[PDB]
Design a protein around this nucleic acid. Structure first.
Ligand SMILES: [Mn+2]
Ligand SMILES: [Mn+2]
Ligand SMILES: [Mn+2]
Ligand SMILES: [Mn+2]
Ligand SMILES: [Mn+2]
Ligand SMILES: [Mn+2]
Ligand SMILES: [Mn+2]
Ligand SMILES: [Mn+2]
Ligand SMILES: [Mn+2]
Ligand SMILES: [Mn+2]
Ligand SMILES: [Mn+2]
Ligand SMILES: [Mn+2]
Ligand SMILES: [Mn+2]
Ligand SMILES: [Mn+2]
Ligand SMILES: [Mn+2]
Lengths: 95, 97, 87, 106, 97, 82, 106, 95
DNA sequence: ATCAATATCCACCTGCAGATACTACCAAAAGTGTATTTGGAAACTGCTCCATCAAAAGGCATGTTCAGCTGATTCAGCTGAACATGCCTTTTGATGGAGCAGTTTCCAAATACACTTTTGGTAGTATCTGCAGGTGGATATTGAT
DNA sequence: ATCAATATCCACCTGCAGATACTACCAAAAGTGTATTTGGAAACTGCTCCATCAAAAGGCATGTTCAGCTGAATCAGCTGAACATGCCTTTTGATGGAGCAGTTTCCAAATACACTTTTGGTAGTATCTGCAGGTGGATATTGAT
């Protein structure tokens, strides 16, 4: 009765943080899920290529970061880059 | 007997359709067209109804966006009436040619 | 199986008022008489292109049923990515 | 046992993202930081759109975000618009916009 | 005293440049611009010679194709003269605006 | 006799490009419009090439950087590698 | 030993194509026929372009294919033009083409 | 020093088969090499997605074939497919 | 119309920048063979949801009328094409050095790999709720006069 | 400007589709811990090939003139918007059954080494040639009268 993952629950958590009294229709959630997969595929792809171009067999947070700068416009790139650095820095000290 | 002038109802319809999101082509006729076209590629196909709805959302967004480009081509010509030359121009510039 | 109706001229199922409505959503105020055939023609090209790739995915998978995903991937291939149907 | 998400301070599933990078055939090797950074970009981006879409919903005196609100949110924002420049949001419709010359009188 | 009419040398030029493939912007001024624009992204950059060439080839192919669309836009408005609003329309419809 | 670099993209040069694009007659205002359009074109491409340079930790922009930049702007170029 | 190119009847290197598929991260596994098939497709298309580009060279009174001839071959062929619709051939120039309304009034 | 592979020699061979008296300039050869790289990437790319969509671990000639039908226009697709099928036969039916 | 200016066509010529033939060599494909793991077709069948249909619900087709838009016509004035040449920017080619790229090296972090715990998905079953679509009924908008 | 048709804007208002809530299960995540391998960063340097600049080259800035193009104005004609009217076609809710997809079993084919032969790329070297420009002279195209 095969299992199908979505980002739904994570989208819902984040929604509660930013608008604690606002809901999301299942269609809007479907679109949110499509958007996360879409962006995921677009960053991983850029990352994939970027690594191939540089003869690297490893995708690291560094390839992810260049991918983010290639893919996102101006101000979203700036913020995504801080958000990502911050999570990795935090992550590094936490084991 | 009361008469709105030509243009008036049309501006009212623009506001009305620009405000809403429902599909504007009737479902069944669209569904038949999809089946006619598909059958000419391959006989004995079935369709998930969500397949047909996906094609309908895609086609309707494609036509609305084309009509916008077409409107701009007409206005460039200093007309307010869209014509086949306007659509042909828009499609040529877009690279569909 | 016994009999199944013949599909023809379904393009005319895209009526004058339906096309007019679409043009309204796209901001169009005045429509020349010949727009309706042109639009039908354009739509048919659009559909042929998407259905062909969708059906190709279908046959590749060895199904007789065209899925939402078949369509969603055909759209992505043609640079007309669609959100809202699993894709 | 703290999830790798909580270690990085994220709602988004770092575990999931790490896995998907491998199954995804992107490179021979995935660095440990990569799913972390990626999951945070993903979370950031979805926060940005939910904020904006939430506002459109409120502006419309609605409590639930529907596809129309995501479309208003994306098309009214220069950067989201360009990022989803080649994307169609089903049941989004369009922005009210009528060209000047089409308006009556003078 | 001899004088060709307006448009006569223009046509002669169209034919000449449509026959050939050499770059039509002088290399040095193009290069300076490239380096100037690059300076805003990172300081103290050097450029492979072939890298500037690539950018020139790309930029000239782009502008030549844009002028074709521009020219169709002008002609759509029943003019034979290209104007900025023609460039504007082409770019808006190409999806660059 | 100082002059902006962009103005180094001269009228006759822009005239030639238009000519290859089959343009017969040119309004005076087009030359500035073109320079602006080139500038945006080059900014978008160079921005991406430079990003490829920085990733590779070089100080030289390579043909490949540019080729890859062009490929991702959907303006694939053949003739310089890749 | 006999090379897979010769077995396949191909000039194009089945070995290389095979290796490039593995190292290109396209899937965990690559079937034995796939590089044969692909090499053939690549050879075919190379032959079709060279055919037409050779001709364009002949027409222009020349024996050495330059990029100009590659361009002429591609843009005068409906199908090759569509496949390369988003490609720029360096040093290709354009097709000779003037809009009729610009032609001098006879 | 480091090895730089190219399709040049194999492109030269095919040229000699098709116009034995016709040569090719460097720049033209460089374009042809890009062409071959570009088409490879495009076909392998599409084959990759097909395999993924169908939850398969292997890119087989079947995926190459479908990729070809997705990417090439009609007549170009037709000949490519037959050239491909023909070569997989010749390869099978030879010790 | 003839006519003269000046562009364009072609046949031939030749130096040289870039094509080419030939040798020597090597690291890294590329192949062949042997030991081993597994992806996915096959063979079966649970069960979701697709084609199909009857009745109900509402949009479409059609023809008449004329408002106002488009396209034709003319025109005057504005604006860009043509014009020729020496100043001055670009092109060319020669030359120190910066940095890309080749090589060696060595460990922080990669994968693998086995038991251990956790959790996201779904399925079964239940109550709650945001808002669509109906309503009447005060507030514009439009167009004739 | 003022009067009257009809669209529009709210506000409230009941049904209800879809959203939200628990309690149970569980396979597959996700984590954990050790054993094992290596990607690529780090540091040293050789030699392309890049920035610079001198001398050499040759394109463009320049202002004037006026041809012919653009945009303004006018207007007849006819196409397309509006609206009335008559009724067909789509939408909706219900149901056997096709085919998708869930689980399990099994081997032809893939991966993984190892060891063996080869080839494509490189580099030194010398040798070759297609064709860009040059020339010279006939012939065509354009614009003047
Ligand atoms: Mn690291
Ligand atoms: Mn048919
Ligand atoms: Mn032949
Ligand atoms: Mn298995
Ligand atoms: Mn009637
Ligand atoms: Mn005058
Ligand atoms: Mn140094
Ligand atoms: Mn749980
Ligand atoms: Mn309501
Ligand atoms: Mn190593
Ligand atoms: Mn005037
Ligand atoms: Mn008239
Ligand atoms: Mn069955
Ligand atoms: Mn050899
Ligand atoms: Mn010549």
């Amino acid at each position: 009765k095969t299992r199908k993952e979505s980002y739904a629950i994570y989208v819902y958590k984040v929604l509660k943080q930013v608008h604690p009294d606002t809901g999301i229709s299942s269609k809007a959630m479907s679109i949110m899920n499509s958007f996360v997969n879409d962006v995921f595929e677009r960053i991983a792809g850029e990352a994939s290529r970027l690594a191939h171009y540089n003869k690297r067999s490893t995708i690291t947070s560094r390839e992810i970061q260049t991918a983010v700068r290639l893919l996102l416009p101006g101000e979203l790139a700036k913020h995504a880059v801080s958000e990502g650095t911050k999570a990795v820095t935090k992550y590094t000290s936490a084991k | 007997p009361h008469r709105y002038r030509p243009g008036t109802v049309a501006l009212r319809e623009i506001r009305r359709y620009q405000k809403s999101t429902e599909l504007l082509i009737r479902k069944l006729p669209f569904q038949r067209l999809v089946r006619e076209i598909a059958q000419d590629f391959k006989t004995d196909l079935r369709f998930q109804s969500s397949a047909v709805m996906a094609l309908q959302e895609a086609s309707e967004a494609y036509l609305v966006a084309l009509f916008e480009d077409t409107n701009l081509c007409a206005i460039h010509a200093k007309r307010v009436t869209i014509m086949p030359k306007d659509i042909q121009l828009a499609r040529r510039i877009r690279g569909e040619r | 199986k016994r009999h199944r109706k013949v599909l023809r001229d379904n393009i005319q199922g895209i009526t004058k008022p339906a096309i007019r409505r679409l043009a309204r959503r796209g901001g169009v105020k005045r429509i020349s008489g010949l727009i309706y055939e042109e639009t039908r023609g354009v739509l048919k090209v659009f559909l042929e292109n998407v259905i062909r790739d969708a059906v190709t995915y279908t046959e590749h998978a060895k199904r007789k049923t065209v899925t939402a995903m078949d369509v969603v991937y055909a759209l992505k291939r043609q640079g007309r990515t669609l959100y809202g149907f699993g894709g | 046992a703290k999830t790798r998400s909580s270690r990085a301070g994220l709602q988004f599933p770092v575990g999931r993202v790490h896995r998907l990078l491998r199954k995804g055939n992107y490179a021979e090797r995935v660095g440990a930081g990569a799913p972390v950074y990626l999951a945070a970009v993903l979370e950031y981006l979805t926060a940005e759109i939910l904020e904006l879409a939430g506002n459109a919903a409120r502006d419309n005196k609605k409590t639930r975000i529907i596809p129309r609100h995501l479309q208003l949110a994306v098309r009214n924002d220069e950067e989201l618009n360009k990022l989803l420049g080649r994307v169609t949001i089903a049941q989004g419709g369009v922005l009210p916009n009528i060209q000047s010359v089409l308006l009556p009188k003078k």
